């Protein structure tokens, strides 16, 4: 994975592997996913990026950048639940993560 | 765009720009798109890849590889109409076009 790997790509790599479901999982509702252990997801992102001071406060800023741009949505009334947006315009952003 | 740009990424770049709608367009039904001028799409792909003998016969092999793998679907009873699949597993394939 490249130095400029997107958080969203890293999350999808984690989500694709059901052996990770103890800390992050597709919920089964469409493109919805849950961060079951948010600080563990952040720790793993820190390892990926060689940023040992990574934490969920930091990681969550990027989730918010994604949902403000309509690439993800934050699921209302839930904690730590997000979804990928299924839409022509969002797909362009995904197609060109660089 | 990198030497290893995927056809699907190239198509999304074309589709994102509505000034291309005379040869390729999102149809408005979800993630469905139509190749209005299939040989023009192929000509442009040939330019992108410096493959001047490109044509739609060749390009369409890749569309078929994508739909056989469940990354796209071919729309039944239609000519030149495809859709991107909105699904956890397909998204992993999109996330890692390399």
Author numbering:
A (entry chain A), B (entry chain A): 337 to 434
Cite, word for word, the article reporting this structure.
Crystals were obtained from constructs that contained the Ets domain, Etv1 (encompassing amino acids 326–429), Etv4 (encompassing amino acids 338–470), and Fev (encompassing amino acids 42–141). Etv1, Etv4, and Fev display the typical fold of the Ets domain, which contains three α-helices (α1–3) flanking a four-stranded β-sheet, with an additional C-terminal helix (α4). In Etv4, in addition to three residues Arg-397, Arg-400, and Tyr-401 adopting different rotamers, the C-terminal end of the recognition helix switches from a 310 hydrogen bonding pattern (which is the form adopted in all the other ETS structures) to a more canonical α-helical hydrogen bonding pattern, although in this case the difference may be due to the fact an ethylene glycol molecule is bound in the vicinity. This interface is centered around contributions from the N- and C-terminal helices, α1 and α4, with additional contacts involving residues from the β1-β2 loop. Dimerization of Etv1, -4, and -5 is mediated by the homologous cysteine residues (Cys-416, Cys-422, and Cys-449, respectively). Similarly, dimeric Etv4 and Etv5 also bind DNA with affinities that are 2 orders of magnitude lower than the reduced monomeric forms (note that the Kd values of the dimeric forms are rough estimates, as saturation could not be reached).
Here, we present the crystal structures of the Ets domains of the entire PEA3 subfamily (Etv1, Etv4, and Etv5) together with the structure of the Erg family member (Fev). Furthermore, a new Ets dimerization interface linked by a redox-sensitive disulfide bond is identified, and this dimerization is shown to result in a significant inhibition of DNA binding, potentially linking Ets transcription factors with cellular redox regulatory mechanisms.
